[PDB]
Ligand binder design. Structure first.
Ligand SMILES: Cc1cc2nc3c(=O)[nH]c(=O)nc-3n(C[C@H](O)[C@H](O)[C@H](O)COP(=O)(O)O)c2cc1C
Lengths: 424, 255, 255, 49
């Protein structure tokens, strides 16, 4: 505790350090404003239940009533009502991926599959995505009255953006959540969460810190450095629960992150984390709907150490490259032939402006058609007399039979979508 | 939309995984080695890895040194700069109250007590499970502080009984006690009837020590028939027995 | 005004800022309250509630000591201290400045504008410009005077002999300049011993002051250089330069 | 109400700037300045509107 004994003009608004009078106070136990010691106050401890089973009591575990190890809500990953079900039955927390649901009729049908199957009393979260303002147009008015019906949806994690303060007030005050997750990617995104917690001092906020070494849509900043500049003023908000993720898969890996002994690599005080979320670890599990040949590919993809994940922008690093999405922000994906072909069109065609776009596709045409048929998952539609072609040189019957080829799964006698059946 | 194929590679050109995009992380792949292990056994095997290290490092290899609680959760780790002197636990307690001491939110903490038990759970849980729901706590507003009231907690929180003043006299209106094992009965008492005999509304709450996020789940079985027998005693009296076999089509005679 | 904290006007001063009846400024709180209290008070030799360090395993005090150049306008800290705490240190710095004037003429011709600090406090018009005041034979004694006042006042506000106020401390150290005041702090015991060791401190930094200017005399700077330095956002050039935001391994890659 | 007067009104209250401060010639992306939650919220409001 720093006591500036020269100057007497207390109080600083953040109360980092004291002034002249704190030497002088004659109250017995009220004179000593203590400094926060991070290694003693919020260290992970153990606790037994009444049934004798042992938990790790952290600040994240105490709010949820279970182990400090949640499964992060992913679009493709967290979409199988079954991966969110029987991992809650294991006793672990999961937020439902809202991104793969497209109407409030379909999600309410999906939530009822969980609540009918998980134990009476368990709860799930809903991971929405803030850069889909269509999904917040129906999903947020869904959560307001579905919680008023009383369903066990207990939290709302907002990925891909931190809301403004007048919006995050409405996400806390009106609709009755237990806690609220936020996933910052920058220091200005972290300091915007601290702006939310000081507006609502008693409501829990689970700050989910993910670095750029995760999967899914990446981030530019390092994992360690932004929180190492911000851990001091996150912990001055006692409601913010800090959770670190982005690349955690084993007990020997992330025990230095819970205990806090990782920052003595960086000549800093021990900096314990309250909880740990899992991303790409849960995909090869039995109760996920990742394809069996796709799970074998992830097993074949050896990982990369943390010291060299920045070279993912150039080369396949362990079989995983980042690549540019529709609107520019990067996306970590595995390095198959189609995803390497995704990058070839990003460096060459997709970065061009509009005036050179139609001319570059004309000169690159039969080469693009070559690997849409061979390498990429969305084929080229034109196929006349077993020759690849343009669309306007196909008959109507072979237009229709190619729509049955590319939209109907003959092995399982079902359509990809009803709305593609309503297209054919 | 290149995304959903991961769990549905069968319905794609030639089921070749390459043709597809799978979202995954660079450092996370070196931990994913064995396939189709269950999602519980992934997270269990790394939780017990953290337990076995934290037994060995900070607890000297002894499991008995670990603190033991009845339930885990519910009490807020966010401690504000508040006076912990007014947190009072007791053995055989009466708590009279007037206009000033205390306010609402610390009055629930006085009736909790520092030790974790069912009454500390039931006075202070945010939620009561009503058949896989999470609806608001009934005691959290019916035990709101009021003038001339008092509550009575006796012999290590085994029964809470709340009083309030009516017509000068002071009679029980709320009773919480344990009944037949590991079940709370919230007995909510109504006094003013036809012949001034007090009648009480039997509620049944089940207590679950294993779950701490929602420890107390309300028994929704036979609930509507408990509430109807209470109103049958009110509107009619105890002189008529409870008969629920009323035929709906026939007209109902009076007197 | 000071109920059961009757010797705690320092915290009483800053609690007056919090009122809305009082428009908040610290200048009318420092003087008009804390100036006039120590002006009016008799003997403060009342050893107050020193139980903070008496639980020795739980609280550990360290007095730490600043160096040269933490602020531009440093002498106004001694201005406001002499304005406010005047009866607490007037016996001290008169004994200081009498020793300095007995050591002042021996280093003439390099600082001609005098070292009469007591004239500079009683008469602000007698003060030189700050470019002379920030120079090394001036600032190295006077910063040692500032640090020896805040130790004197903290011993005298609490009413402690410095030999037993030193007993409340576990260890101490100084920065660039104030290390001589840390070895002053462990050598001083009573009120007579503290002055004898403080005079050996302020006379010491008249030799560190004069001989570091007599060895490396600051010469005139080309006005292309300093006007460039003010326009680049840097400071006015001086023989020490602070580099932030870089590691020690990469700064030495630049030097 | 017209489209031109509709988008402007909603955007004016979102950016907390005078109605003239937002020229309808440009785009929200360049008008916001770079905020990930700024542009997302702007469109979100209009999306549900
Ligand atoms: C297959 C997969 C799908 C994902 N879907 C989402 C999503 O819909 N919304 C979101 O904010 N993050 C999403 N993520 C990011 C993760 O939630 C988390 O931030 C990251 O995976 C942690 O990195 P790690 O897998 O190395 O531990 C996804 C990650 C993977 C591997």
């Amino acid at each position: 505790r720093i006591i500036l004994a020269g100057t007497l003009d207390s109080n600083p608004i953040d109360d980092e350090y004291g002034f002249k009078h704190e030497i002088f106070q004659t109250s017995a136990d009220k004179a000593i404003k203590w400094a926060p010691d991070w290694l003693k106050e919020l260290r992970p401890t153990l606790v037994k239940n009444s049934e004798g089973k042992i938990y790790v009591k952290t600040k994240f575990s105490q709010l949820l009533g279970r182990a400090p190890l949640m499964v992060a809500g992913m679009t493709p990953t967290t979409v199988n009502t079954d991966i969110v079900s029987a991992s809650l039955n294991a006793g672990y927390h999961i937020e439902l991926a809202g991104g793969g649901y497209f109407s409030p009729v379909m999600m309410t049908r999906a939530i009822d599959d969980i609540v009918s199957r998980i134990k009476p009393g368990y709860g799930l979260g809903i991971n929405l995505i803030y850069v889909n303002p269509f999904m917040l147009q129906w999903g947020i008015p869904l959560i307001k009255d579905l919680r008023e019906k009383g369903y066990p949806i207990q939290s709302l994690t907002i990925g891909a953006g931190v809301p403004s303060i007048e919006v995050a007030t409405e996400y806390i005050e009106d609709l009755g959540l237990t806690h609220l997750g936020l996933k910052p990617g920058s220091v200005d995104a972290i300091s915007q969460v601290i702006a939310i917690a000081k507006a609502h001092p008693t409501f829990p906020i689970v700050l989910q810190w993910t670095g750029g070494r995760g999967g899914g849509h990446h981030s530019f900043e390092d994992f360690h450095q932004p929180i190492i500049q911000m851990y001091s003023k996150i912990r001055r908000c006692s409601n913010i629960v800090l959770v670190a993720g982005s690349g955690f898969g084993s007990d020997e890996d992330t025990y230095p992150y819970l205990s806090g002994y990782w920052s003595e690599k960086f000549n800093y005080p021990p900096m314990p984390f309250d909880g740990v979320l899992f991303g790409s670890r849960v995909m090869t599990s039995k109760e996920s709907h990742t394809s069996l040949a796709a799970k074998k590919l992830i097993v074949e993809c050896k990982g990369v150490p943390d010291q060299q994940w920045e070279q993912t922008y150039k080369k396949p690093t362990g079989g995983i490259i980042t690549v540019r999405s529709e609107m520019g922000e990067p996306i970590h994906k595995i390095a198959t032939r189609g995803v390497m072909f995704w990058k070839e069109l990003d460096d060459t065609i997709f970065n061009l402006p509009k005036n050179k776009l139609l001319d570059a596709l004309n000169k690159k045409r039969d080469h693009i058609i070559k690997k849409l048929n061979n390498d990429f998952q969305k084929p080229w539609f034109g196929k006349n007399a077993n020759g690849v072609c343009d669309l306007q040189e196909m008959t109507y019957k072979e237009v229709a039979n190619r729509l049955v080829e590319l939209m109907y799964v003959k092995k399982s006698h079902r359509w990809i979508d009803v709305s593609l059946r309503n297209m054919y | 939309d290149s995304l959903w194929q991961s769990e549905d590679l069968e319905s794609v050109v030639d089921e070749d995984v390459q043709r597809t995009c799978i979202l995954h992380g660079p450092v996370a792949s070196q931990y994913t080695s064995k396939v189709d292990e269950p999602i519980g056994d992934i997270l269990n095997s790394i939780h017990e890895g953290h337990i076995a290290r934290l037994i060995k490092e900070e607890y000297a290899g002894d499991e008995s040194k670990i603190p033991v609680v009845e339930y885990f959760g519910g009490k807020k780790p966010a401690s504000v700069s508040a006076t912990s002197v007014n947190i009072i636990d007791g053995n055989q307690v009466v708590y009279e109250i007037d206009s000033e001491l205390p306010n609402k939110q610390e009055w629930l903490d006085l009736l909790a007590g520092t030790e974790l038990n069912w009454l500390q759970a039931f006075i202070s849980t945010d939620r009561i499970v009503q058949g896989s729901k999470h609806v608001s706590n009934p005691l959290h507003d019916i035990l709101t502080p009021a003038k001339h009231s008092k509550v009575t907690i006796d012999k290590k929180t085994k029964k809470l009984t709340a009083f309030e003043n009516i017509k000068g006299d002071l009679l029980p209106v709320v009773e919480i006690e344990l009944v037949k094992p590991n079940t709370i009965q919230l007995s909510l008492i109504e006094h003013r009837t036809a012949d001034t005999n007090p009648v009480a509304l039997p509620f049944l709450y089940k207590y679950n020590p294993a779950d701490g996020f929602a420890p107390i789940l309300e028994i929704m079985e036979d609930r509507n028939e408990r509430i109807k027998e209470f109103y049958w005693k009110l509107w009619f009296g105890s002189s008529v027995p409870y008969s629920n076999d009323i035929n709906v089509e026939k007209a109902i005679l009076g007197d | 005004f000071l109920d059961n904290n009757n010797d705690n006007i320092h915290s009483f001063a800053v609690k007056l800022l919090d009122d809305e009846t009082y428009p908040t400024t610290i200048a009318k709180v420092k003087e008009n309250i804390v100036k006039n209290y120590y002006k009016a008070v008799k003997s403060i030799n009342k050893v107050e509630s020193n139980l903070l360090y008496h639980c020795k395993h739980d609280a550990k005090l360290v007095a730490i000591f600043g160096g040269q150049g933490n602020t531009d306008d440093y002498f106004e800290e001694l201005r406001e201290l002499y304005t406010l705490y005047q009866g607490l240190i007037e016996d001290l710095l008169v004994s200081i400045a009498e020793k300095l004037n007995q050591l002042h003429p021996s280093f003439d011709k390099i600082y001609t504008q005098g070292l009469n600090i007591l004239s500079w406090l009683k008469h602000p018009e007698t003060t030189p410009d700050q470019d002379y005041l920030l120079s090394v034979p001036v600032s190295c004694p006077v910063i040692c005077v500032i640090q020896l006042c805040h130790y004197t006042i903290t011993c005298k506000v609490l009413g402690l002999t410095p030999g037993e106020f030193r007993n409340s401390l576990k260890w101490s150290t100084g920065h660039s300049q104030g290390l001589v005041t840390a070895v002053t702090i462990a050598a001083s015991d009573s009120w007579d011993s503290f002055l004898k060791n403080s005079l050996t401190a302020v006379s010491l930094l008249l030799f560190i002051g004069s001989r570091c200017l007599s060895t490396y005399p600051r010469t005139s700077l080309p006005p292309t250089m300093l006007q460039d330095s003010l326009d680049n956002g840097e400071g006015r050039p001086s023989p020490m330069l602070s580099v932030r935001d870089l590691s020690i391994k990469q700064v030495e890659k630049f030097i | 109400v017209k489209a031109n007067l509709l988008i402007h009104v909603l955007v004016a209250q979102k950016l907390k700037k005078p109605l003239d401060a937002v020229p309808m010639t440009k785009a929200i992306k360049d008008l916001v300045n770079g905020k990930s939650t700024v542009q997302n919220e702007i469109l979100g409001d209009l999306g549900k509107e």
